From TrEMBL:
Protein name, entry field: Sesquisabinene B synthase 1
Origin species: Santalum album
Necessary cofactors: Mg(2+); Mn(2+)
SUPFAM superfamilies: Terpenoid cyclases/Protein prenyltransferases, Terpenoid synthases
A GO term, aspect molecular function: terpene synthase activity
InterPro entries per UniProt: Isoprenoid_synthase_dom_sf, Terpene_cyclase-like_1_C, Terpene_cyclase_plant_C1, Terpene_synth_N, Terpene_synth_N_sf, Terpene_synthase-like, Terpene_synthase_metal-bd, Terpenoid_cyclase/PrenylTrfase
Keyword Lyase: yes
Domain Terpene synthase metal-binding: 233-457
Similarity field: Belongs to the terpene synthase family. Tpsb subfamily.
Ranges of residues in domain Terpene synthase N-terminal: 1-172
UniProt keyword annotations, A-Z: Lyase, Magnesium, Manganese, Metal-binding
Binding site residues for Mg(2+): 277, 281, 355
Name of one Pfam family that matches: Terpene_synth_C
GO biological process: diterpenoid biosynthetic process
Length: 506
């Protein structure tokens, strides 16, 4: 967490031409395996492994085709383990599978899962993971969640294989569906190695690809670190280590090398959001904040000198950065994005002002009122719209306008990030609920957790509906949520060193 160290990064890369060469050789082999004949359950398992290792970006097409072909039922209809894995993978890849596929395993009278299945751990694990792919009203899945969760909790201590035990403990903490991809990949690499049926070729490739991707991140980090010091925001009292935290968060949103420029831009915005949050929350005067907001709405800087230095610098950095991001869009994408960057920052500042205002005037909002504002203040509408502006094919005023309106797919993601943040961490989601219902601290928290689950189902359903959206925006929307879950469970320092700094030994 030292800037001199960070700035240094990217200067010297661990990877070698030898490493690169071996990687492309290995990739082809993995491609062969993915498309090659294999027992069906094994293939599903292999494909799942590829995703878990963070390699889906590499083989998205081969993977889809393999699943498509897989979509002769003898291999899976008979066993729940196969059924659940099949259900999850198909759904994750856009192939619908009805929940009724799980009925045979239920007691018809009770509608409950047979106690007989609790003995096999993998069976329970697949069922549990598969349940997070459910939509609203899919009660079978909801039943599967509570059943598998309870069983897994019961059987965790009865497990003898330590590796399996680690996996179960990991799943109970967070299902795979909710885990940030890059981070999960690092953890899994070590785990996969110890699996009995592990494929050495995939593992090797996973290690190589990780190191290679990492080198790109290291280079990105160095530039960002130099940029941050250049702004001078590093010497400001607020937001210590905001940049690295922001970059780490962005890694969760997008980790791919081909998206490095976009990632760097997201990281800059993230760092600013964090710093400005502190300006509004702690440092600034209402008079100062209202001015900060007004200057932003107008995108007019005539009055900036009115503000004190500690506030003026963050305001100018936000202004300059937004202009730069907007310009990049004009240059690379042939579409001036400044109006859009400016607008989402205006909305964001307004959300902050409102919170500051409630706080300076003693208002206590209801949960819906708080959330209506808070989904905006978390900063995700800003991050996502910007992300859209920089990646969408043939951008237009109309497209940007639709995204900025916060349709359900986007809105759901923003709400989730906010609630996830509040659960992990004046007045937040829980207190607002307590007051609306007077409910207990424990009961309210339970209620919020319910919202998370509810919102995810909606997000899951949105993926199957017709949409204006395409990759990579669809992924960004889902990924920011995962990023939120990861950050809100010194533990960040360990994740930083393991994923960004230290290469995997070969
Ligand atoms: Mg705040
Ligand atoms: Mg001027």
């Amino acid at each position: 967490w030292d800037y001199d160290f960070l700035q240094s990064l990217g200067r010297h890369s661990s990877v070698t031409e030898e490493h690169v060469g071996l990687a492309e050789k290995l990739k082809g082999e993995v491609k062969s395996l993915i498309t090659g004949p294999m027992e069906p359950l094994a293939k599903l398992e292999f494909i799942d492994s590829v995703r878990r290792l963070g390699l889906k970006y590499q083989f998205e097409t081969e993977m889809k085709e393999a699943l498509a072909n897989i979509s002769y039922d003898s291999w899976w209809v008979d066993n729940l383990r196969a059924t659940a894995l099949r259900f999850r993978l198909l759904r994750e890849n856009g192939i619908f599978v009805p929940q009724d596929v799980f009925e045979r395993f239920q007691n018809k009278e009770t509608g409950k899962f047979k106690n007989e299945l609790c003995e096999d751990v993998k069976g329970l694990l697949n069922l549990y993971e598969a349940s997070f792919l459910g939509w609203e009203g899919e009660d079978i899945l909801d039943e599967a969640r509570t059943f598998s969760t309870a069983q897994l909790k019961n059987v965790e201590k009865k497990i003898s294989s330590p590796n399996l035990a680690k996996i179960v403990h990991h799943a109970l903490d967070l299902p795979l569906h909710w885990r940030a991809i890059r981070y999960e990949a690092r953890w899994f690499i070590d785990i996969y190695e110890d699996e009995e049926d592990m494929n050495p070729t995939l593992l090797k490739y996973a290690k190589l690809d990780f190191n290679i991707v990492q080198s790109f991140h290291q280079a990105e980090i160095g530039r960002l670190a130099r940029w941050w010091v250049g702004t001078g925001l590093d010497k400001l009292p607020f937001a210590r280590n905001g940049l690295i935290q922001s970059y780490m968060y962005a890694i969760g949103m997008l980790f791919e090398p081909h998206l490095g420029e976009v990632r760097e831009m997201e990281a800059k915005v993230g760092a600013l959001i964090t710093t400005i949050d502190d300006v509004y929350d702690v440092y600034g005067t209402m008079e100062e904040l209202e001015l900060f907001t007004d200057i932003t709405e107008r995108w007019d800087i005539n009055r900036v000198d009115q503000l004190p230095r500690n506030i003026r610098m963050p305001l100018l950095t936000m202004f300059n950065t937004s202009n730069d991001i907007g310009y990049w869009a004009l240059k690379e994408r042939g579409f001036n994005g400044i109006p859009y960057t400016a607008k989402v920052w205006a909305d964001q500042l307004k959300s902050y002002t409102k919170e500051a205002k409630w706080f300076h005037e003693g208002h206590k909002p209801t949960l819906e009122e708080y959330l209506e504002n808070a989904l905006v203040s978390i900063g995700f509408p800003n991050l996502l719209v910007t992300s859209y502006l920089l990646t969408v094919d043939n951008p237009t005023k109309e497209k940007l306008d639709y995204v900025d309106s916060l349709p359900l797919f986007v809105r759901a993601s923003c709400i989730l990030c906010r609630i996830i943040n509040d659960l992990g961490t004046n007045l937040k989601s829980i207190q607002c609920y307590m007051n609306e219902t007077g409910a207990s601290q424990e009961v309210a928290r339970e209620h919020i957790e319910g919202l998370v689950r509810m919102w995810w189902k909606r997000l899951n359903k949105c993926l199957f509906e017709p949409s204006p959206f395409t990759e990579p925006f669809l992924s960004f929307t889902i990924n920011v949520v995962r990023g939120s879950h990861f950050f809100y469970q010194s533990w960040t320092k360990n994740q930083g060193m393991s994923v960004l700094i230290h290469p995997i030994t070969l």
